[PDB]
Amino acid sequence: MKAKEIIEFIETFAPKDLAIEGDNIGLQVGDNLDKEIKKLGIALDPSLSVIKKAEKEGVDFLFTHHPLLKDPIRNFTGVIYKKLKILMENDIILYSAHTNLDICKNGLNDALAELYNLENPKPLYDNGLGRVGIFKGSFEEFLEITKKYIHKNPIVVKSKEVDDNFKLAVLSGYGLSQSSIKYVAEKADVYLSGDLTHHSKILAEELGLVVVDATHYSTEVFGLKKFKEFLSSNLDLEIISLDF
Amino acid sequence: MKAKEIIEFIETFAPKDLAIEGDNIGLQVGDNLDKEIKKLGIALDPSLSVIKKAEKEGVDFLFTHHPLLKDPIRNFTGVIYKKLKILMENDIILYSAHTNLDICKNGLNDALAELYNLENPKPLYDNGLGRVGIFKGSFEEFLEITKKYIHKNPIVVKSKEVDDNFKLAVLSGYGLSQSSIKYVAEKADVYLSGDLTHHSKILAEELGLVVVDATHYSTEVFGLKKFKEFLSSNLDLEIISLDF
Amino acid sequence: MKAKEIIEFIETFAPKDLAIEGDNIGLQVGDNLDKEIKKLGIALDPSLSVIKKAEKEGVDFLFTHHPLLKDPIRNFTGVIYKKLKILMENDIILYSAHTNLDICKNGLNDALAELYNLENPKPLYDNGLGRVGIFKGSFEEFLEITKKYIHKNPIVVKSKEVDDNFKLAVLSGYGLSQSSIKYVAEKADVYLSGDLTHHSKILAEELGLVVVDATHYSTEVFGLKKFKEFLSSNLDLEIISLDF
Amino acid sequence: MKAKEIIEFIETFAPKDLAIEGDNIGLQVGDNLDKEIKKLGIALDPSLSVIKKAEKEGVDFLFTHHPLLKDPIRNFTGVIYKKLKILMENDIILYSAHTNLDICKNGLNDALAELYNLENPKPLYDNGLGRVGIFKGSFEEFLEITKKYIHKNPIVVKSKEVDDNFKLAVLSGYGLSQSSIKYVAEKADVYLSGDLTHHSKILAEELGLVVVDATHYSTEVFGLKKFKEFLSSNLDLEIISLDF
Amino acid sequence: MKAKEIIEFIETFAPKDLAIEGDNIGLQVGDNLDKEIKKLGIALDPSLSVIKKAEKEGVDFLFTHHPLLKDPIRNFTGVIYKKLKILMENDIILYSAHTNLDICKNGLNDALAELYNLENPKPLYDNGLGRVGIFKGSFEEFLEITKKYIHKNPIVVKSKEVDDNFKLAVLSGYGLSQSSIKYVAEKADVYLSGDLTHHSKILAEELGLVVVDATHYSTEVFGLKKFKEFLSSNLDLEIISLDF
Amino acid sequence: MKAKEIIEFIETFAPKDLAIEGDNIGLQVGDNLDKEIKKLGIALDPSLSVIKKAEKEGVDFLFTHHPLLKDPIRNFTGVIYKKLKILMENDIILYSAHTNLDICKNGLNDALAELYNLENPKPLYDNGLGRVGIFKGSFEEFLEITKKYIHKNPIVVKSKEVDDNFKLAVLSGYGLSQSSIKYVAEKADVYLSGDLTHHSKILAEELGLVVVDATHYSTEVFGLKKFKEFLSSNLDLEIISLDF
């Protein structure tokens, strides 16, 4: 399989114009997309560890959820230097599907919507992120589900009592900034995401929004793992995981 | 019946303050507002054709939905020369009611809402455009109405199954732009508008918003026809459609 | 009770970061928060009257809902001079909790929501302001409550008939601007707030949104009285109202 | 002789790209450039008076220094309706050379310099406007050369004692701006231009710049006449002034 | 005499509209422009120290060169609280002439350009600040003038030889920022101003501009001193200085 | 010789804070600055050719005048990928002094001022770039000094005839863009720089400035050669040239 083969498959599943404004998705590093690919590695972050592990395990196509750089640079030293050296020396391709993999059909968010069997889900945000629907069940049933498949000990901000069949909002990753709490407060009863700060915790309690912090890692990995199966089940490649 | 009176009647049906920020509504071309109006001509667009047919039919007050120019200019050459030429040579007044007609009670958007008999309809966008409510029927009957009343073969992106009594958003004109689509996907099961783009279609299929494109023309001309009947009913003068 | 204790007590109830962007909340005028406080006066507005009255009453901590200044200055002349001269000459502390008091749990907006016993209420705006939920009753029952507890002769714009159990939006203060109304029109059947312009009236009529103008004063002062009681029930302090 | 060739010729004398930023130079109103021209009028501005006179005289190419519209418009009524009316019914072409004609070799600004017999003259402003140099002579011969050839009675601000052989900056048209004074005060002893607000006057005195206000009309038409003579001489077809 | 006349006098020498863009000139803290004035004070800076001294000396009109605030504020605490409390308890008026006093004839910049008898002294910057002219002498003479009148031990940055009869630029106050140094370097050989940052020194050595740091206090208080006398020689007023 | 010592040397000569706003100077690609340097290579440009010759001729420190990237990037493919690879497999350090090397004492502009022996030469622009001064000589003398040392067959725009002892302006590199041409024409009789656009030609002609285009290669390489010898004189290690 050529590099371009894989990239085409991915991009058909997670088209690039799904990506929110400014998101650095697609080819991060690479000079030849005709190159044949023996091993594909999959990670959350293109960290220095992941890059080294990739080269050690002989990965020649490195796919990561996060991009190598959010903000552009024009000077190459420190960590970024090291990351680039390895990738280029070993001719490893780094390719990224960030928000487009979150937003796409059956993507990271839909995976959470599907997990909780959300009735009539809709996107949560103006930019396509997150899903929101009714959870046909009790709050504790929802809690169990979170504990069983997402993250075993989630911090809960019980801001209000929660009736059966409540509106569940889910966002894979970092979804618990203040602006996001305030926004989702209009649209839901419970908000399942990751990275609750004290300020945001107070805010949630003030507006009556029930937050469950399953952390950014766990919600991402859950979707990413199913993307691995999808990758595995549809491609001949040896595919391994480096972050999970 | 003077021109200013006709203007006052229309401005009473659709007040100018209803217009979205920026819209160029009102007196487009014209100097003598006391001038007695003999034949009123109504068209969707003040194209070079319409402005010629106005000259041919002795139209001396020309109403359009679309304004003459979106963006100002300070040089007069090309088509716009020709347009202003035919208009000032024959002292034909040109007047437009644009998004104010899209937004007012029983305007172009209400026209659509009324046609599908939307249960508890409400404005779709923050600026007052579009309507959204429950369609008390099958997706099928919605299709039937659309075909029967608006456009005979709409392109349809059946992004997922549509259960009976679905939420239908409607927008007359060019409503199928990427920004629109993601926003409407939060609020509706089915979106009826015109002018689907490739990028727009993909967002829709991915987000699960079923989209129905019946062109900017067909969706606008429906409400515009009702507007003509409305003018003919309340105003004693001949009114021709130059455009439908 | 020291100044800084009262402030802590107020800020624990109405956390500052709740405030909307740009809001001038907190300490308005003061130098020694360690000082001792005998008499706390509470007002809507830090008007010249309120400040004049404050001093003659021996109020040494003056709380207001509105900040002393929305827009900053670098010159001290006329009215603002006269206000500061008093506050300073008498070392009277001036401190506001504005939209943070509008937004917090059991704040000015939650008060109204509870007055009307809204069913499953949620915030109205992206920034925490307003509450919206179902009013389990008839429109008439709803007006009688408005008349009894808020303002005896509210102006009503009956743009549409209102069925029982309608969706009711409430916004304490100045919530009846053209942009506000366009927005709430998407989300409510009836909008209860204060201060209607003629354009806002017409716009509400075109969109189908029934507006009840109960004045900005009446909708704010209802909640402040609740806040005053709460303060009285919690502080061993003399608290008087300068404004109501 | 055709329109384009007249234009081709004028752009020869004054290249369009010489013009300052955002200055509206070139074709103002015109349909067709293969139109054989008969009479060519010129004037400073395309006022209504100039434009009626141009039609009256059967002028079919109207050259103006000042362009028709500075800032652009998308509505056509009032004075601009009238102007655009006359030019289009009588197929009259309107062309402008504004700052390019102020700037080019032997432009209106060189004209003031050439006439004033200046020592080693150079551009006065960053954008190519004005000329500055030494006047071999006295103040008095200078006032005289002005009264006789420019404006028979100028207003003099005698900020400073002026000595023979001085720095004389000249600027054709409006150039007594409060900031044009501040700047020209660095770079000359005497400023010669047009239209002195009492503010500009007081400033120039305060800084020691000697200003001589010969109005905008006088100093602009001086150059224009030469351009007129430069025009009639080098081309066959007849050429009148409509403004001087 | 009365406050509003003192102010009318100061604005007779120094128009407020002479001051550069955005400068906070005029009344700083004042309510009663018809207050009879007994004891005028002049200071460079309205520090808390000066303001205390004004109340202790019984000053009832405080004139400073620098404004009380450059940036507008809407809260009042700490230092500004203190300055205001004293200025308002004692009803002391604070008025300021800033760059208007720097720019006027015989202002703070002309003061320097006369100490050094500069020949043909012109404005330095585009905003009217500063004076530049040929110094009819030797660098040595220049520097001895500087040490006697302005400031005794000025830091000199001299990277090359100043000839005789050179371009001297003077700026009262702070004129030794980087970008100004780059700019005076195209226009003078020597540059007398205040406050040299290290980065600025380096820049001056590199570009060949000879810089004399005379402190900002000294280069200002020189011309302030001509003022205090000019003011004393024209008013029946007790006039004392609180900063010199 | 450690890399940091080499760097600290260059920066002593041409300090970093000398560079114009936004100029990407300093370390460009490099991990280890303690690295020992056996062979320094210098070039005008970090072109792909140059980076290859550096690897070929065993260069372990590459100094360039021009930076590797002016505009930031966050994707690594194509040319930039190739440049980066060679520098990072081979651990070659890329470093640059750009406008700081044009602006520093005895930098690239001074070198030209040196070569033409300009009388009391000063910075041309506000940013520190360029040099202007009296050329105590004849024009044909100037031409010969130019043909001999800079570039053999200059392209010359003789717009006006030149007196001996004229003002000469030099700018190492790209300096013949229309905006520059207008500025310089205020300040100089002849302007010597590189890369003359046809639109810049006419502008100079019409403005009456003499322009001598000796390409940007030659004008920069002249002072680059002097800088190279300077390094040699003061430093061990072999210093080769890669562009000249």
Numbering used by the authors:
A (entry chain B), B (entry chain C), C (entry chain A), D (entry chain F), E (entry chain D), F (entry chain E): 6 to 249
Please give the exact wording used by the authors of the publication that reports this structure.
The Se-Met labeled P21 crystal structure was solved at 2.8 Å resolution by using the multiwavelength anomalous diffraction (MAD) method. The P21 crystal form contains six molecules in each asymmetric unit, forming a hexameric spheroid with a 32-symmetry. The MJ0927 hexamer can be described as two stacked trimers, consisting of monomers A-B-C and D-E-F, which are related by a two-fold symmetry. Contacts between molecules A and D, B and E, or C and F occur through the interdimer interactions.
MJ0927 is a member of the Nif3 family and is highly conserved among bacteria and humans. The crystal structure of MJ0927 determined at 2.47 Å revealed that MJ0927 folds into two interlinked α/β domains. Six protomers of MJ0927 are found to form a novel hollow cage-like hexamer, in contrast to the toroid-shaped hexamers formed by other members of the Nif3 family. Additionally, we found that MJ0927 is a DNA-binding protein exhibiting the ability to bind to both single-stranded DNA (ssDNA) and double-stranded DNA (dsDNA).
